[PDB]
Design brief:
Helix content of chain B: 10-25%
Number of helices of chain B: 8
Structural class of chain B: mainly beta
Distance between the termini of chain B: 76 Å
Number of helices of chain A: 3
Shape of chain A: elongated
Largest interface: E-F, 67 and 66 residues
Largest sheet of chain B: 7 strands, antiparallel
Radius of gyration of chain A: 26 Å
Shape of chain B: globular
Oligomer: part of a larger assembly
């Protein structure tokens, strides 16, 4: 039952450096391993030097959802084979490169 | 039929109208019914008021006094401050002479009560001031209690009525009546959140209140030109009573012995709401028409209350209008010819990502309070933006934590009325006769978690 | 737009997990409906 | 007319597709059939696929869930002798 | 909101679609900027003529406001229903705000004499907001699953009223009202009006946003039924019988002459 | 008329009108409540009627001849309007909206 | 009490749609629409 327990009882969240602000809010910072040494080797901490981005929750394409279930549904549903009353249409792919 | 006075058959034809659509709404074996209220037992408890013993000096205007919370109870759930106003007697030998009136400031309470803080041992857990008090009382005011709150805190059309000198027609004495201000705290927000004094035997609970000097509480108006100058001891008879008597009354409760020892020795987590104010920013509409303020907050903010406060005269307070009030006919204060909020539009930016565009001032003034609050302010100013569905609800709703958020900024565009009132040139009794100055204030309300264990409190997340 | 919505949705921490979140967390925008009794009323001398 | 009949043309999106979310694609919903107040909408030109494929994708190297291991591995963690026991912020994202 | 049908004008009807990219739309309000009114000295009534905005400037000039899906008439509200609802279910404290935000500011309803008279006050020009009462705006628990509705087209149609009946032209002596004319006021009557529709959307985490997909959902909503108006002549008869006809489970009946 | 004017809003509403007119009769315990309360569907009901008896002030104001600044300086006309509020059910499935009962 | 009120059984009441039917010869016997989508 010491005095001033509340100040020393608990924990505080990590505080980020001013460099973290420049990171892309949507796309997380690229994972780059820091270097060490005694010659101009900055030992910056990625924990408060990297930005995780906003993609972590929105992305994932687990089973349904995302940009794969809709891809499969569109590919299955859109019709193929001749045109008859028309001039033929090709299937446009929405994949990445 | 007949349909006599004691007629009941008319409802049977209404009951007969039931097919294929009311089956979804009414009916069913599990359907509840009205006229049969389920009764459940509740706890056994009593409550009574209790004086709080002073610990640091005596109350005095312009000074700070501290009072220790009375322990040995079971739960503390109300606290309020009562203070008796002095007696004001104008003198014919005043500096302004015949053309001079003295009156109490608008919202006498919420003024001379600032930096009201609650401390556990030697660490602060909550602190509020005038701007937060005004915004909260204007945005979360239950109707029917408005007249009572006005009688409690001043502006009762009797304290703030200008009084001329003794030799003039108006020689009324300003009454010396006691006023009561409830203290909004996390334990006072709801009866569910109450301080466990039985579970806190080691911590010491203290409340610090700092008043304001009497010089910056009396409006010394000029009768004709509407000029405000600081008051002096020789201006009024009897001098200035620096020392005043003030009491803090607190309500404690008691619980049954079966549950007093049942919950002893447990780890408890409580969710509370607190405030945090951005530093003031002087606004000069003459140079630039836009003003940007950086908001640097930490926890999960719930709403942002902002307004622009006229700061030309220190004597006048709670004036968020581009023109200061002046004396009017019948020895009553009247609003000037033009009285509009200096804010024209506002926007929010998250590091070059504008979340909220240049929306009009009427949005924050009317649309937001009508949807996500309990009341709409009746005075000009007091704009808000709430991230939560209901501001007044203690239960957490949608919110964002600014700790992981980058530097956020708020931008405000000035108004033509403010930019023309900033310079002088106003005529007599126009309010803006002298050049006007404005300041911007930002208030944030956020959530936090308090842990009780081992007979002590603390913040597990800081 | 919704980029700002994504930005302030991405702000999630331990306090936010304590308050919101959880598999059993009841969500708004969906109100449960329960049947009530069938009745009628009318004034009477 | 031979050059005209040679080749095909790109698909023609309906005006309803322009109201969808450009960043994240809208949810895949199977259209209903029937001869009573049922619309046979075509998802191919009625849905928006979003942009979660060109910039999005949980790559082996890139990805927030890939930076997570780096952050945890290079985090100091534990209890320190010169601070206030800094707590590990958890990103996750499970609602 | 992206307007895709017509243009906002007094007396015409314009439609606005409800876009996706939200998850639950739960609030909609129409903002409209009133013109500048300046009485002229050439009015037919001469000196004995005053012009003032009608009572409930908003809640007027907005009638037959409809919400539809695809091409089916879903729900509608009008002036009398708006007045009854805002007179019966008004929450105190917000009453002053509503009566200031829908007009009725005592600065537009105060008669203004002509230019040559002592009172040369002009009717101020400002913007007013009317929150559209819809089933999704009634409660926060009722919101449109916009992501779950990608195969429809939600439309809101607003039909404004002409400026002729929005201005009361009173006679200072006999208290008579006559229709206004373009030459009566300075600058003519601006048929085009400046107005927008704003909506509030909500965003949710994907893990449940697309876990709620592919399901059947049921909602209970409230609509109106307005019987055709019946002309009543008290001179001939004192008692009037009117036969009604409604379809669904009526909750309450509002009436007035 | 004072019944519908005052008594009904006192019990089955959240407010009482501050202007003349606006008469209400509600089958539900709370008008503003979203959750369904007592109500009778008029589709299954046969024809229903409302009988209204007017005040002598209206009949004496219908004829003109009033002096200046009296309001009834000219003959007055009236029209009765009736509005009802009803519940309905909306079903959402397969990306479509529609009534399941028609 | 309630014996006179609950002893009887009221006659059926028809909707206003029946009033437009043919009195001399009845309507054709047709089954009603049953379903959960725009079905009366």
């Amino acid at each position: 039952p010491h005095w001033m327990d509340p100040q020393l009882m608990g924990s505080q969240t990590t505080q980020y450096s001013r460099n973290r602000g420049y990171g892309d809010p949507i796309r997380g910072d690229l994972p780059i391993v820091p270097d060490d040494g005694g010659w101009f080797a900055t030992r910056a901490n990625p924990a408060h030097h990297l930005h995780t981005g906003a993609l972590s929750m929105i992305g994932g394409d687990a089973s349904d959802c995302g940009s794969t279930a809709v891809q499969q549904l569109i590919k299955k549903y859109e019709d193929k084979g001749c045109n008859n009353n028309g001039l033929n249409v090709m299937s446009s792919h929405y994949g990445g490169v | 039929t007949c349909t006599t006075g004691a007629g009941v058959t008319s409802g049977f034809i209404d009951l007969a109208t039931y097919d294929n659509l009311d089956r979804a709404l009414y009916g069913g074996k599990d359907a509840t019914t009205y006229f049969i209220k389920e009764h459940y037992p509740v706890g056994w408890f009593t409550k009574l008021p209790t004086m709080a013993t002073r610990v640091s000096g005596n109350p005095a205007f312009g000074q700070e006094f501290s009072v220790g919370v009375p322990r040995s109870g079971d739960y503390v759930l109300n606290a309020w401050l009562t203070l008796k106003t002095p007696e004001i007697k104008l003198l014919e030998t005043n500096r302004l002479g015949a053309n001079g009136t003295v009156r109490w400031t608008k919202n006498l309470m919420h003024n001379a009560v600032e930096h009201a803080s609650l401390t556990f041992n030697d660490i602060c857990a909550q602190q509020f001031n005038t701007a937060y008090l005004d915004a909260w009382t204007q945005f979360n005011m239950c109707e029917g209690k408005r007249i009572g709150y006005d009688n409690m805190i001043g502006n009762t059309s009797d304290m703030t009525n200008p009084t001329p000198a003794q030799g003039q027609d108006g020689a009324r004495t300003l009454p010396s009546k006691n006023l009561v201000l409830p203290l909004p705290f996390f334990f006072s927000r709801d009866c569910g959140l109450a301080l466990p004094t039985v579970v806190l035997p080691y911590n010491e609970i203290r409340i610090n209140i700092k008043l304001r000097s009497l010089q910056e509480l009396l409006v010394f108006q000029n009768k004709d030109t509407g000029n405000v100058i600081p008051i002096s001891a020789t201006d009024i008879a009897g001098g200035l009573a620096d020392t005043v008597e003030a009491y803090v009354y607190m309500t404690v409760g008691l619980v049954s012995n079966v549950e007093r020892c049942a919950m002893a020795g447990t780890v408890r987590d409580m969710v509370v709401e607190q405030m945090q104010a951005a530093p003031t920013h002087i606004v000069n509409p003459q140079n630039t028409n836009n003003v940007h303020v950086d908001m640097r907050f930490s926890h999960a903010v719930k709403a942002l209350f902002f307004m622009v406060q006229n700061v030309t005269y220190k004597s006048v307070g709670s004036n968020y209008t581009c023109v200061t009030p002046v004396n009017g006919p019948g020895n009553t204060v009247m609003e000037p010819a033009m009285s509009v909020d200096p804010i024209k539009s506002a926007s929010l930016t998250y590091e070059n990502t504008t979340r909220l565009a240049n929306m009009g001032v009427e949005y924050y003034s009317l649309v937001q309070p009508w949807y996500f609050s309990a009341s709409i302010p009746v005075y000009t100013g007091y704009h808000m933006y709430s991230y939560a569905l209901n501001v007044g609800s203690v239960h957490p709703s949608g919110s964002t934590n600014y700790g992981r958020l980058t530097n956020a900024s708020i931008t405000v565009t000035m108004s033509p009325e403010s930019v023309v009132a900033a310079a002088g040139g106003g005529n007599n009794n126009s309010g803006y006769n002298e050049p006007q100055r404005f300041a911007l204030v930002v208030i944030a309300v956020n959530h936090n978690v308090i842990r009780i264990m081992n007979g002590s409190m603390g913040f597990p997340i800081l």
